[PDB]
């Protein structure tokens, strides 16, 4: 089946990236004809078992997998506030993904409302409404 | 591809915004209604107009070693030009019209490739999980 071959390839790419994003806690991502499942301790589990930061890692791992699958490489990546809700766990995971993986990408444009992420970035600007108009401040 | 710079004037909360993009991770911090969101919309408009998502938008980007520049102005009426850098000057890559530029972009960087492999939005994540 052509469909099966595609979902299979995407799953392989997603597995490698997710395993990297979770320090090997999860060995693979399984794509069922389309539902996703993760492997932990040799068993496929539903996504309902993932904690906050792991959900962010999985969603991004899958997007990155699709990117590689379709373009063959990643030059530019634009994350337009893909995960606006950010608690302690989610934030730490995102910062981890930024400094260990995203910094390997030629160019990444990350839009967020979280000031704490600035330390894991190469260049930073802050935008704010001043007297009714957007004002840009170069921070780095 | 890589973005180099975008200038946005009279678009949403932007009166005269200029943003440079560099190598590595470019973080744009801002709160709701700050204009961070509309800035990305201006880029999408700059690259893929016409689409649904005096206003002036000027975008410079790099693709396959060639430096490109798209400039759009919405008066009524609208002006659209897409050029390439050659030595020290910019030259038209195609007829300075909305349709010609749109056709060129779909061949240079197809809209589906941009949304499926480059642009990550919350909706996609939600759909995955």
Swiss-Prot record, chain A:
Disulfide bonds: none annotated. ATP binds at residues 25-26, 49-54. Part of the Rad50/Mre11 complex, which is involved in the early steps of DNA double-strand break (DSB) repair. The complex may facilitate opening of the processed DNA ends to aid in the recruitment of HerA and NurA. Rad50 controls the balance between DNA end bridging and DNA resection via ATP-dependent structural rearrangements of the Rad50/Mre11 complex. The ATP-bound conformation promotes DNA end binding and end tethering, and alters Mre11 nuclease activity. ATP hydrolysis promotes both Mre11 activity as well as HerA/NurA activity. Also has reversible adenylate kinase activity. Homodimer. Forms a heterotetramer composed of two Mre11 subunits and two Rad50 subunits. Homodimerization is promoted by ATP binding. Binding of ATP induces a closed, compact conformation of the Rad50/Mre11 complex. ATP hydrolysis opens the complex. The two conserved Cys that bind zinc constitute the zinc-hook, which separates the large intramolecular coiled coil regions. The 2 Cys residues coordinate one molecule of zinc with the help of the 2 Cys residues of the zinc-hook of another Rad50 molecule, thereby forming a V-shaped homodimer. Belongs to the SMC family. RAD50 subfamily. This is DNA double-strand break repair Rad50 ATPase.
């Amino acid at each position: 089946l052509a469909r099966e071959a595609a979902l299979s390839k995407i799953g392989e790419l997603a597995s490698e990236i997710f395993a990297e994003f979770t320090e090997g806690k999860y060995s693979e991502v399984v794509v069922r004809a389309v539902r996703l499942f993760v492997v932990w301790e040799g068993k496929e589990r539903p996504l309902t078992f993932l904690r906050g930061g792991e959900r962010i890692a999985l969603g991004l791992a899958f997007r990155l997998a699709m990117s590689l699958y379709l373009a063959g490489e990643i030059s530019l990546l634009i994350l337009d506030e893909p995960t606006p809700y950010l608690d302690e766990e989610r934030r730490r995971k995102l910062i981890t993904i930024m400094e260990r993986y995203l910094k390997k990408i030629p160019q990444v444009i990350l839009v967020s409302h979280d000031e704490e992420l600035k330390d894991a970035a190469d260049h930073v600007i802050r935008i704010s409404l001043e007297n009714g108009s957007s004002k840009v401040e170069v921070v780095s | 591809m890589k973005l180099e710079r975008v200038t946005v004037k009279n678009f949403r909360s932007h009166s005269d915004t200029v943003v440079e993009f560099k190598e590595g991770i470019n973080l744009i911090i801002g709160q709701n209604g700050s204009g961070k969101s509309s800035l990305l919309d201006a880029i999408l408009v700059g690259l893929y107009w016409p689409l649904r998502i005096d206003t002036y938008i000027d975008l410079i980007f790099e693709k396959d070693g060639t430096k490109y520049r798209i400039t759009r102005r919405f008066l009524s009426g609208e002006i659209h030009a897409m050029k390439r850098l050659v030595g020290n000057e910019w030259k038209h890559v195609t007829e300075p019209s909305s349709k010609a530029i749109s056709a060129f972009m779909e061949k240079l960087i197809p809209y589906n490739i941009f949304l499926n492999a480059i642009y990550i939005r919350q909706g996609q994540i939600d759909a995955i999980l």
